[PDB]
């Protein structure tokens, strides 16, 4: 018998990469707002959608 347990919160690992995820996580891991050219990368991803 297992006699103890840790708190298992469900964790969702990223199954693959998309572009807005990639730019948002890049700007996030540096702890800043999205700078102007990040927003341009997102913008020309949107116009090309």
């Amino acid at each position: 018998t297992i006699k103890a347990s840790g708190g298992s919160s469900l964790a969702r690992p990223q199954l693959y990469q998309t572009v807005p995820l990639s730019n948002i996580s890049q700007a996030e891991q540096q702890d800043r707002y999205l700078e102007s050219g990040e927003l341009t990368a997102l913008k020309t991803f949107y116009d090309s959608g």
Binding site: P13, Q14, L15, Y16, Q17, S25, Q26, Q29, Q30, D31
Partner: protein, 49 residues
């Protein structure tokens, strides 16, 4: 062991390297990353500590 299929499909973390050659804001952002990782929150710019 972790399969490479699990690693390439993952939330890829930015590794901040301190080389002495680097530009000056790069050393600034890397020192910012070290303050964020050790102190768990960015203690400069939010307390000027």
């Amino acid at each position: 062991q972790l399969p490479q299929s699990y690693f390439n499909a993952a939330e890829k973390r930015q590794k901040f390297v301190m080389k002495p050659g680097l530009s000056a804001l790069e050393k600034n952002s890397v020192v910012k990353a070290a303050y964020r990782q050790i102190f768990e929150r960015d203690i400069t710019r939010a307390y000027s500590q």
